[PDB]
């Protein structure tokens, strides 16, 4: 169970553990946590986003979707005290552009160029900070992702899945090879 | 005639008749005036208890709301009392929440909002009163009026009650903008005297003033002195 995401000049790159969910044609919600709680939340958010689109004729932006999700998670934490959900959110705008949002388990929202979850953190974030540039390309971002996974695996760890990756751009969500 | 009994019924020409009848009830009360001067506001009215069997310090028509707000009415007293109590409570709530005395306009808006509700539901009756409200905020005076329908206006000088059209006509030609408080009091008493229907005494009229020091109701001695002066 690990999540990772890198934002670029005109694209967003994400990679999950084989956990992604689709809210809109250009919005993804990657959530990780105890089973049975991370599916109901995603279903509720997806249904609400679809209802908004049906009622208004246009689609919610990633910023408004992230704020809606943050408020709903905050309202949910107050009732069910044994509740623990961690999630990310990526999207694309016709006005602004790429957007990556980071959220913790206490419903605190922050917009970051890159983020990570799961057991592998701290050193991965440091490596991303050291090797990250705002004008990074897709191939270079894939190279950094592969090198980060290689550096993390050597620390007495085993990666079971192939860490499937996806791209969000002006065209839409694209499925890439499992790398 | 079929639309003259119900409150929630529109006339075919688009009129509400019960509100007009409430305004007619207002127009049949005792006269009252209000003049805004350069440094204060004065409110005057004519008493109802014109007898020797009346205890002077029992019931008053000029009442204070806050240290800087006071009001007078024309219409039905029982409807006036409950509105006065509600206004006092609203002012106290505002002070408690914001730690600052309420401005006159906010209080007028809240009172008008309370009054408006009784004109849209069945099984109730509109208030039969109209209020004159004076205040002092940010070093300048204010004067407002409120109808039974929930609408309010800001005036420089106005009259209401019995025979108020001629009172407004008198005020139109007797009013000056750069006017002091004493001459404003003289003009208010003269306007009240225009249609008194009797002989005025310091025991059948009430006067209240508002200035930098705050709202205050005048004593009968001062009223007698002013009456002798004019």
């Amino acid at each position: 169970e690990y999540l990772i995401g890198i934002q670029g000049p005109d694209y967003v790159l994400v990679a999950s553990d084989r956990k992604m969910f689709k809210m809109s044609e250009k919005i993804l919600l990657l959530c990780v946590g105890e089973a049975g709680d991370t599916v109901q939340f995603a279903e509720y958010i997806q249904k609400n986003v679809q209802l908004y689109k049906m009622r208004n004729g246009y689609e919610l932006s990633p910023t408004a979707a992230a704020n809606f999700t943050r408020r709903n998670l905050a309202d949910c934490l107050r009732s069910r005290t044994p509740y623990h959900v961690n999630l990310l959110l990526a999207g694309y705008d016709e006005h602004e552009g790429p957007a990556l949002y980071y959220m913790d388990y206490l419903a605190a929202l922050a917009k970051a160029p890159f983020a990570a979850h799961g057991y592998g953190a701290f050193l991965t974030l440091s490596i991303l900070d050291r090797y990250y540039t705002p004008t990074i390309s897709r191939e270079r971002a894939v190279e950094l992702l592969r090198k980060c996974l290689e550096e993390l695996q050597k620390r007495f760890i085993l990666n079971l899945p192939t860490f499937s990756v996806r791209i969000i751009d002006k065209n839409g969500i694209h499925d890439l090879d499992n790398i | 005639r079929g639309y003259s009994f119900s409150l929630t019924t529109f006339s075919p020409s688009g009129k509400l008749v019960q509100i007009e009848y409430a305004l007619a009830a207002v127009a049949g009360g005792a006269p009252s005036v209000g003049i805004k001067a350069a440094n204060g506001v004065v409110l005057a009215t004519e008493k109802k208890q014109k007898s020797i069997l009346y205890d002077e310090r029992s019931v008053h028509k000029v009442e204070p709301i806050t240290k800087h707000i006071g009001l007078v009415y024309s219409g039905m007293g029982p409807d006036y009392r409950v509105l006065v109590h509600r206004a006092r409570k609203l002012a106290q709530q505002y002070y408690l929440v914001y730690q600052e005395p309420i401005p006159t306009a906010q209080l007028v808006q809240r009172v008008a909002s309370v009054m408006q509700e009784y004109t849209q539901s069945g099984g109730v009756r509109p208030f039969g009163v109209s209020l004159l409200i004076c205040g002092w905020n940010e070093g300048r005076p204010y004067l407002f009026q409120s109808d039974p329908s929930g609408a309010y206006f800001a005036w420089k000088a106005t009259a209401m009650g019995k025979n108020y059209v001629n009172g407004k006509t008198f005020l139109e030609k007797r009013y000056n903008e750069d006017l002091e408080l004493e001459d404003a009091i003289h003009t208010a008493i003269l306007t009240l005297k225009e249609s008194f229907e009797g002989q005025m005494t310091e025991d059948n009229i009430e006067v209240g003033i508002c200035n930098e020091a705050g709202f205050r109701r005048l004593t009968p001695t001062e009223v007698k002195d002013y009456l002798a002066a004019i």
Binding site: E43, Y44, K47, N48, Q50, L51, M54, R55 | -
Partner: protein
């Protein structure tokens, strides 16, 4: 008499206020719906096109979900409430059961909502009627109608609003198994049905088309003009 209250029966068993609520429907713009072999078509007359009006805000065709659309005739303000309630109920049922909702299910929900308002003297019924059309999960096209009283039926072709009598008379004889062979033929049939009661050419026609595994699409005025020209040429030939 016996018509001054919603819940008073006539001496011969009639509820006259609910029948008066349908006279409002009988005064709205004409709406026509036709169920094809693998396509469903809707069409609404456009009346009183003002010069300084925005047409985006006066559309009479709405999309309830990804596979259900609807058209209405009657009071314009009453339809908005029903449309919003149906839109919310579709997502609620999708939460309840994972599979997409059914046209009959949403029609039953709308009918029950309409029937709820004919039970008390403190509220008045909804003066609208609707044509609910869409596709099922297996892929069978469906078409339904709803009444202000709360009754619904299944049809193969229908019309509401003024001119419904003449439009239905035309459809009863012009609706065969050959006219619904292709999407173009179905669209031509709908346009022909509309043109019986609509004057001033094909400039007062609004059309909507839905296909299998696709979303609702609204035809352009140029496409409508092309279809009208083809129909006129075929008639002249």
């Amino acid at each position: 008499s016996y018509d001054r209250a919603i819940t008073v029966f006539s001496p011969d068993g009639h509820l006259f206020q609910v029948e008066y609520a349908q006279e409002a429907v009988k005064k709205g713009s004409t709406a026509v719906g036709v169920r094809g072999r693998d396509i469903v078509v809707l069409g609404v007359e456009k009346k009183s096109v003002a010069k300084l009006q925005d047409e985006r805000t006066v559309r009479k065709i709405c999309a309830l979900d990804d596979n259900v659309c609807m058209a209405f005739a009657g009071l314009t303000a009453d339809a908005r409430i029903v449309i919003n309630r149906a839109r919310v109920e579709c997502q609620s049922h999708r939460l309840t059961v994972e599979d997409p909702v059914t046209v009959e299910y949403i029609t039953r929900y709308i009918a029950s909502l309409k029937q709820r308002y004919t039970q008390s003297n403190g509220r008045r019924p909804f003066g609208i009627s609707a044509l609910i059309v869409g596709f099922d999960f297996d892929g069978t096209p469906r078409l339904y109608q709803t009444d202000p009283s709360g009754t619904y039926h299944a049809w193969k072709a229908n019309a509401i609003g003024r001119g419904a009598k003449s439009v239905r008379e035309f459809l009863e004889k012009n609706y065969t198994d050959e006219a619904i062979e292709t999407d173009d033929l179905t669209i031509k049939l709908v346009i022909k049905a509309l043109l019986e009661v609509v004057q001033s050419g094909g400039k007062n026609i609004e059309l909507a088309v839905m296909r299998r595994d696709q979303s609702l699409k609204i035809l352009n005025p140029e496409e409508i003009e092309k279809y009208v020209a083809e129909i006129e040429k075929e008639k002249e030939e």
